[PDB]
Amino acid sequence: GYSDRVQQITLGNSTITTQEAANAVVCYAEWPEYLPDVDASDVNKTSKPDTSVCRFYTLDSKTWTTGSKGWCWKLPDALKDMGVFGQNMFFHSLGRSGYTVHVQCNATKFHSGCLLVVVIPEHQLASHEGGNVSVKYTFTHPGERGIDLSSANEVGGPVKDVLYNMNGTLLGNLLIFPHQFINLRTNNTATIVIPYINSVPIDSMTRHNNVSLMVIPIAPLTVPTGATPSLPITVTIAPMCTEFSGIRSKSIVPQ
Amino acid sequence: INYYKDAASTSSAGQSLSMDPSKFTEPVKDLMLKGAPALN
Amino acid sequence: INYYKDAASTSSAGQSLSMDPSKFTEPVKDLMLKGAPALN
Amino acid sequence: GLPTTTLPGSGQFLTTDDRQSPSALPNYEPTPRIHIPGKVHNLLEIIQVDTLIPMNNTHTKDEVNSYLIPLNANRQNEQVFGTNLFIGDGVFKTTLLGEIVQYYTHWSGSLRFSLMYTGPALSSAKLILAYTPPGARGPQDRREAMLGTHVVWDIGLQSTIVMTIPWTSGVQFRYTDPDTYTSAGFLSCWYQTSLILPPETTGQVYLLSFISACPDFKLRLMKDTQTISQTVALTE
Amino acid sequence: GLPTTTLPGSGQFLTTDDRQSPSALPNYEPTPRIHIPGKVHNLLEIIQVDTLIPMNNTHTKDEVNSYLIPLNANRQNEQVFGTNLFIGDGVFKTTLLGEIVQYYTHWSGSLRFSLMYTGPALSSAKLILAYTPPGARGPQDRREAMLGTHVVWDIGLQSTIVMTIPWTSGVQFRYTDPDTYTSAGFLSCWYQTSLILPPETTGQVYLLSFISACPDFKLRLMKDTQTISQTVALTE
Amino acid sequence: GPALSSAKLILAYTPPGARGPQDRREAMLGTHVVWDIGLQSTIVMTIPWTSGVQFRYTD
Amino acid sequence: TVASISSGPKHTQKVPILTANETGATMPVLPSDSIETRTTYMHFNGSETDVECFLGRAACVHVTEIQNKDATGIDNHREAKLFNDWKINLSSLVQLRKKLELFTYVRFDSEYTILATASQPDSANYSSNLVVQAMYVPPGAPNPKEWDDYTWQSASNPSVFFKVGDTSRFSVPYVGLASAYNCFYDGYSHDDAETQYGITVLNHMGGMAFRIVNEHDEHKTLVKIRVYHRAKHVEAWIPRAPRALPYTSIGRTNYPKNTEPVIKKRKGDIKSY
Numbered sequence A: 001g002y003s004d005r006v007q008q009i010t011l012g013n014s015t016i017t018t019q020e021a022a023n024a025v026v027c028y029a030e031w032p033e034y035l036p037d038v039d040a041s042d043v044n045k046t047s048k049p050d051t052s053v054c055r056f057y058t059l060d061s062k063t064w065t066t067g068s069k070g071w072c073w074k075l076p077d078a079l080k081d082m083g084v085f086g087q088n089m090f091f092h093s094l095g096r097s098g099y100t101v102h103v104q105c106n107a108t109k110f111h112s113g114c115l116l117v118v119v120i121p122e123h124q125l126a127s128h129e130g131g132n133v134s135v136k137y138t139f140t141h142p143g144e145r146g147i148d149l150s151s152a153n154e155v156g157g158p159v160k161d162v163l164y165n166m167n168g169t170l171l172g173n174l175l176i177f178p179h180q181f182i183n184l185r186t187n188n189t190a191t192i193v194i195p196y197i198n199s200v201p202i203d204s205m206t207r208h209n210n211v212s213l214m215v216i217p218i219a220p221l222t223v224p225t226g227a228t229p230s231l232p233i234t235v236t237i238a239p240m241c242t243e244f245s246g247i248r249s250k251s252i253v254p255q
Numbered sequence B, C: 001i002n003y004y005k006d007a008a009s010t011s012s013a014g015q016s017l018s019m020d021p022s023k024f025t026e027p028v029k030d031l032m033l034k035g036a037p038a039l040n
Numbered sequence D, E: 001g002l003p004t005t006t007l008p009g010s011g012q013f014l015t016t017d018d019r020q021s022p023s024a025l026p027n028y029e030p031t032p033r034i035h036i037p038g039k040v041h042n043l044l045e046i047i048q049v050d051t052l053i054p055m056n057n058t059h060t061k062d063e064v065n066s067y068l069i070p071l072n073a074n075r076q077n078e079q080v081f082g083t084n085l086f087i088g089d090g091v092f093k094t095t096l097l098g099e100i101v102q103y104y105t106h107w108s109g110s111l112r113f114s115l116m117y118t119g120p121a122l123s124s125a126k127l128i129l130a131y132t133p134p135g136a137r138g139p140q141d142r143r144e145a146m147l148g149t150h151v152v153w154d155i156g157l158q159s160t161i162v163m164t165i166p167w168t169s170g171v172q173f174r175y176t177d178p179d180t181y182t183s184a185g186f187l188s189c190w191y192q193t194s195l196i197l198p199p200e201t202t203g204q205v206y207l208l209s210f211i212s213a214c215p216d217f218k219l220r221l222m223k224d225t226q227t228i229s230q231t232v233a234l235t236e
Numbered sequence F: 001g002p003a004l005s006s007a008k009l010i011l012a013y014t015p016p017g018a019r020g021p022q023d024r025r026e027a028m029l030g031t032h033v034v035w036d037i038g039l040q041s042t043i044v045m046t047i048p049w050t051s052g053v054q055f056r057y058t059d
Numbered sequence G: 001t002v003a004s005i006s007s008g009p010k011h012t013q014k015v016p017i018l019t020a021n022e023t024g025a026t027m028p029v030l031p032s033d034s035i036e037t038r039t040t041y042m043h044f045n046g047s048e049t050d051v052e053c054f055l056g057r058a059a060c061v062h063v064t065e066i067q068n069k070d071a072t073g074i075d076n077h078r079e080a081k082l083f084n085d086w087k088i089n090l091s092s093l094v095q096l097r098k099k100l101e102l103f104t105y106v107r108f109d110s111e112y113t114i115l116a117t118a119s120q121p122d123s124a125n126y127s128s129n130l131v132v133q134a135m136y137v138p139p140g141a142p143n144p145k146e147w148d149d150y151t152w153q154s155a156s157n158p159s160v161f162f163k164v165g166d167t168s169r170f171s172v173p174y175v176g177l178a179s180a181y182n183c184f185y186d187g188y189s190h191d192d193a194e195t196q197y198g199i200t201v202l203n204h205m206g207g208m209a210f211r212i213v214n215e216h217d218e219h220k221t222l223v224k225i226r227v228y229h230r231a232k233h234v235e236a237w238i239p240r241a242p243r244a245l246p247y248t249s250i251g252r253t254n255y256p257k258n259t260e261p262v263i264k265k266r267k268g269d270i271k272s273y
């Protein structure tokens, strides 16, 4: 009586149940694991807070309306302030982590709409100015708020044009990245497990984000007659196999 | 025959002949069998 | 393959892979053990 | 001194030849490799992942909406969409498949075309997808369409339908770039019965459509893509 | 006559290639080697010998005094010295380590920083040395400093203290030449308790400081040093 | 609720030492379960024994 | 290898063509799951789509130019092209760039070919024969100031001398600092509020300097350098969506404003063929 459909994920002191899942994606078919010695470089023993950092943090909720263009969060940024995960983050020189991402959106059998939930490794954004204008730090570190693709261009911020993925590629091809759809008629959640993907064994958690999670409405939300025209979307994310190394004074970052 | 000492100096590599699209085409956690229902 | 008769005409030598810094880093007459006191 | 003779071609530089060269950095030791998920070995590995087709091309500036094929409730017998199968041009051209095919001169193989339905769960519909092999015109009505490769799709719990365009061909390779002799057919879709919405519901519903290549597929003779060009060198 | 084809690069002179050449002096017999103490095989052998760092760089013309870090009796909580760790520049630059690092583009490894105390034997002191890994600012007070790599040094019979800056890094190599992304941290030193001089004694005492590389160390991709140049050829 | 409705609730247990949470952000950092309302009508949350002292008074 | 097996009529409870794309998988459906097929063999291996093959041919990566002329009274050799210099990089020209950016991280050895041809746009009695000297000036090493500085001694820095009209060729090992080169980098060099974003900060490869060794003749001679790059021993990870809009800058993803629709509009209906 197991269905692909019902699932439970327990991680730390927190549990999620979905009764309307559509399997789960594990990026590149690899599950998060700690850093092996053969791959290690820094000689420091690392710190593995385990259950105090590897639990589920639910970010603040978004509201899908008929005019929504899509939202974008960066990792580990989105979690920069969650509990002890965040403290560890500002206090060590280097850290590394994988995540379980669970995006939630329920409706009824009269609604229609379909969101794309995708994880993009190394999502370098484009400046809407063109040329070689850079995208300032603050703009690519929105924190739990994430970036709202239907917000206005700002100065020093990225471009927010959806048919171009914020980088000069077409929305249609985002499907080459680990992703899952939430089609109100099928699905009510999306779950993706992200292994740590980098060109170095461990890195800085503040100067470099290693994935952007993106939720994009593709088939517009259509509510039943005289229904309220909107649904909330909630994102809950859990660091998994986290390791921190090179402890010290506590980083100070712009803004 | 390599005439040179360093590995960078050798010619192109030879075909992976690796080929396994499943990391890209089927990264699902619970295995899906073709023919069985997608969602049970 | 050497094409030439004299030794000077051969290519560069190949790595010493000798490496022993102690003549420079520890030329002391009575051996010092790390962890034992320097001056007894 | 060993006697030699040099042949025609001596001194030429062929950008495609593969030979040994002296290393400028004798004895240098590269950084160790660490493990990174995701290694690609063949472009054939990636063109099997499906991506969305902007089938609804009828707009005037690129929009998320050209990915949506609309469906109308209560129409009978009528046609949902049509396209030829020049995978290197037209709707296909910006898709990952289209985009890679363009790096090669010839392609052969089967294509997989699927449609995922997004209408309310309490609605229902039966569509027919038809592949018309080279030699006939794009079908003009379902009767015409239904006499070639087709699948009656019944919209249900299982949200997507995967149609295969089996390789139908005299010549074993076709050019990517639109050739006549080498042309592959048409793909059309019609209401088999009709879309029906539940009460309290209204308007258009949309289908999303994807394209990817079957394991069947072959691409050969690499060349340059018409999809990218430039007028002056870029700088930092 | 055997048929050949010559490739691109024929006739070039690459200063780094290693091939055979005819000897101009056929059959000449070199002088026998005799034994000489001191043979060097790797530059890695010599960068492990420690040499003095002109830490006290604050003078205006080079002087023996910039090797001396002064210490003041009776100060509490305060800071003895500070420096970043760009081994290819600044204090490090003229040291043997600094001087060799400059012949290579990339370095990786642990550094050994030691301090030898020279104050009267009847004095006493406790200092803290702190290494701050990349990512934070140079510490501004001991509280800040003590939260990173540190050693409380107790001045005693044993005159020197050897602090190691363990390799703390994401990227496995850093440039010698000052790179940001690639930067290595800061090194600071503060009074842990304070220097105390015996009676009949007065003034400043000094610490000498050395730097050498741990056996850990790697240097790669040789290049030319900014440390030497010229405007006309020399003559006899 | 009617069978054709849907809902997702979070239940949170806050162990001794902090105040009753004032908003979900605060609540979600302690023991919690996201409940998805479905066919399966009930959700069972456990308040695991979190305690220094091994017994507490009822009163 | 069979490309298609033989398959006949089906009337089952086992439907391989109905799936749920919401899952993120592309189910491996074949012609034989939905029509009746006959056996056929592949006759093909997929050799020429190997990434080593795809990135393994020489591409032009840079065209620069230097001139041989009397430097007498020139206050800025660099500025007179008495010796140009190039900030090594692999995204200045776009044909190869789009190919590499199909991947996120890439690792390979490089084989460089350098073609140099001379031009004599104004009245010369003859064509002189010039020798070019290209130096590798990695970052941290003195960079040339005049066309005949001590720098050109290049006692520790690899340099090649070849003749104009000829070609020079040598191969450099993978010089990246990490395990792979980042084709993309969503980071900064440090948490600065105004530091540049992108890879510009990561792809610190240093520059390469060209000059003519010859002193000047009576006329002036323009020498134009073309650098070709061939990847050998390629390794690529994490495929990405291909580049759709035009490029504007080395190292940023930025596209131009008021660009044109990249998807071709139908001449007709959705229903059109």
Ligand SMILES: Cc1cc(CCCCCCCOc2ccc(C3=N[C@@H](C)CO3)cc2)on1
Pocket: D024, G088, G089, G090, G091, G100, G106, G110, G134, G135, G136, G158, G159, G160, G170, G172, G175, G181, G182, G183, G203, G205, G208
């Ligand atoms: C004489 C002489 C001249 C030289 C040059 C040595 C080669 C050094 C260049 C190293 C390779 O440089 C790069 C730069 C960028 C990239 C790259 N950028 C991203 C888009 C992808 O790859 C790769 C290699 O060596 N000897």
